[PDB]
Amino acid sequence: TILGGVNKHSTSIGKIWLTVLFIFRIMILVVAAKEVWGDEQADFVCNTLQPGCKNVCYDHYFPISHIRLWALQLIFVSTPALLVAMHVAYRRHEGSLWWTYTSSIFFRVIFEAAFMYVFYVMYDGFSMQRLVKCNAWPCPNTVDCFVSRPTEKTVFTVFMIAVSGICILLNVTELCYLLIRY
Amino acid sequence: TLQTILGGVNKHSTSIGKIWLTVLFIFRIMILVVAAKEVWGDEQADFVCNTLQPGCKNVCYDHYFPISHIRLWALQLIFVSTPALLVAMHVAYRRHEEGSLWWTYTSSIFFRVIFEAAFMYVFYVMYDGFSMQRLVKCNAWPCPNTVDCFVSRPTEKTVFTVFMIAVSGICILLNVTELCYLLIRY
């Protein structure tokens, strides 16, 4: 019903393509992705005998796991759609509505652009490495630690980034139509 | 029936109260449920202490985490929502057959700000700020002189701690404006 409640009050591009891609991301996140990151810390392996070196090295290289960045991102970009829907809902039950609608799609592009930026700086590209070298205290000189399932995590990382990039373009095209029509 | 219950809660509210307060409430619940609840999944499983003394890990973990963060947020969310459905059924009881409606409403928004302030106060005093440390030094019995123990995911837990505090602080501001916005109309 939440899906069927937001069916109306949109343009042909905004009718479906944004919505189907949004459903696409959630299905990938829930059905498939969350079991890949299930044992991110359980199978983190470091070659040392120092107690506590594993905890600090894992926390240093993964300040926040990918699945929870995407979970945050989905929540943020969902609110402007939801908020405008209920905003127009009670009055129904032109200039102002146009003012709100363009603002609604203006926030989406901001959030997705902001979040794609974070992955790039934080994780230094979209590819995961098999080996990480760690020298934070209490670890001795330098320690080799090994990541769990690096290849599978890369595949979903690329998949999510590419789909997010598509959603940016669709929002932009929706904006330009509303720009020319004024 | 999350949509249905709040739909009744939506009735007889001011602009900011109609939209902004309830969307923030769903915002906090979503973060707590789908994201944060499994950051703290292995609080005690990956607590690590550098000692050979049996039971030092149990006493040191309990000394530094008297109550978990997620279980404080759960308690806070329960408390701040009770006045919501308290009035909902109370009027439904009366309806089944202004000032009283006024008296109930201003009291309701007065308890919400009280509970949020009190709970937000507990985090500060009991955890000494909003930032967790990688290392905790423990000397409670039966541990020998002083033992180093290491926390699990200190950086991630800090991120959600800040995010929860910031959102809770906003809910206080909206409630305060609601009181001022309401009082002037009289």
Author numbering:
A (entry chain B): 8 to 100, 129 to 217
B (entry chain A): 5 to 101, 129 to 217
What does the paper say about this structure?
Connexins form large-pore channels that function either as dodecameric gap junctions or hexameric hemichannels to allow the regulated movement of small molecules and ions across cell membranes. The hemichannel is composed of 6 connexin subunits arranged around a central funnel. Each subunit consists of 4 transmembrane helices (TM1–4), an N-terminal helix, which lines the funnel entrance, a cytoplasmic loop, two extracellular loops, and a short C-terminal tail. Here, we use cryoelectron microscopy (cryo-EM) to determine the structure of human Cx26 gap junctions under increasing levels of PCO2.
To examine this more quantitatively, we carried out a further classification without imposing symmetry and with the same numbers of particles from each PCO2 dataset. As the N terminus is located at the interface of two subunits, we created a mask incorporating two subunits and again carried out a process of particle expansion, subtraction, and masked, fixed-angle classification as above, but using four classes (see STAR Methods). From each dataset, 125,000 particles were randomly selected from the final D6 refinement. These were symmetry-expanded in D6, and the same mask was used for particle subtraction and 3D classification, with appropriate changes in pixel and box size for the 55 mmHg data. Red boxes indicate the full, extended N-terminal helix (NT) position, and blue boxes indicate the truncated, raised NT location. The remaining two classes in each data set represent intermediates between these two extreme classes.
